[PDB]
Amino acid sequence: ILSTASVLAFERKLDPSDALMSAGAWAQRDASQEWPAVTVREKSVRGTISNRLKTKDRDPAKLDASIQSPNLQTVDVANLPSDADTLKVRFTLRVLGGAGTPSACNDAAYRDKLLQTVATYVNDQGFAELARRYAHNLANARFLWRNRVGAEAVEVRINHIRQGEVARAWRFDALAIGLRDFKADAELDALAELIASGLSGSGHVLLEVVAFARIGDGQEVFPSQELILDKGDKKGQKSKTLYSVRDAAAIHSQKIGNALRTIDTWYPDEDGLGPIAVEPYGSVTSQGKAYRQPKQKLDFYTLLDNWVLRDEAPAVEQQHYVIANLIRGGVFGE
């Protein structure tokens, strides 16, 4: 009998970089090669005790009167200069190709069957529905996470770097293209064709993405906050640390990958909520939900194990979901 392999290692296609941030004035976006980078400052604030107080075994009103007395915190903040109203976010993106070919597989018969199934998918249908949604998520600047909610003009410039030059430069208005529906455009299907050629393996694809946003003069930008687990003893810590490449505020590359990866509009309880990041057991931990629970038979693992082993080929949307999870990569097994 053919069973799934115990070691399965799928490499990451659509490799992003750390997206570095700088600041400048709008309409000077063309000469934005020398804009000063946004630096992370550390500031100390004094505030009130603003949390639900524990009232289990403390004093009723004596030691629980930590109110009427401030608390003193020391956090980080990234700001624009006072004479700059435009955040510029720049990163690179490689599109590798060879999606369903794992870098490690124990069962070789399973590897041959999986490669046959993936090549069957790519030869009956191109990489035309995945790369279109990837080019859409590149088009609207969803990689600006909280830097997109209050902007009046978001413009994305995408260069296809050929040797050391540019070979094709796209320029999209990221606010006309919504974050929830995938329309068609004369400049967007060309980028979808280029990402499809990179995904199938027809050519080496390297893109430089740079997005400008008008937020305002001297306002606050939100780079990636670092993950530091603070402890309950010896309190009075920092409790906010923003990530930085060398004296420059930046976004984590996995955050850019998550905002480029959110193409899943096929989950059984959607009526127009919008795309979700393609995950096995596709879940938003910030929103608290977990769509495609294994109670329903729409998990990545059940769909893959029914497609490859039992040859129960799913619907075309679920095929797009499974191949998007293979493009993301990961560790599968026993």
Binding site: D57, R58, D59, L63, D233, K234, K235, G236
Partner: protein, 100 residues
């Protein structure tokens, strides 16, 4: 400052003994400083102790520490006194409530 951080180092290096002590004898000085040497928050497991977070320990530990430092440091300037005791008491009390 060196004396109170030595007391903090004594509280930290005696956190390496065991989580759970008991009512082992000699409780004539061992009710306020009983809980300054922390119960490691792992032997408790159902909140069997109600005065662990009542606030009973830090001012009393600072008071009895400053009384120890009063009776220990008394030069030819013989009396040291109670306001100095309250000052060193609140000093160690701030550095003990700084843990949470």
């Amino acid at each position: 400052a060196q004396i109170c951080d030595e007391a903090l180092q004594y509280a930290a290096r005696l956190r390496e003994l065991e989580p759970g002590w008991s009512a082992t004898p000699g409780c004539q000085l061992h009710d306020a400083e009983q809980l300054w040497l922390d119960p490691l928050r792992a032997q408790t497991d159902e909140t069997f102790l109600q005065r662990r977070l009542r606030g009973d320990w830090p001012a009393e530990v600072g008071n009895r520490f400053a009384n120890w430092l009063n009776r220990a440091v008394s030069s030819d300037s013989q009396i040291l006194g109670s306001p100095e005791a309250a000052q060193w008491s609140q000093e160690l009390s701030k550095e003990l409530t700084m843990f949470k």
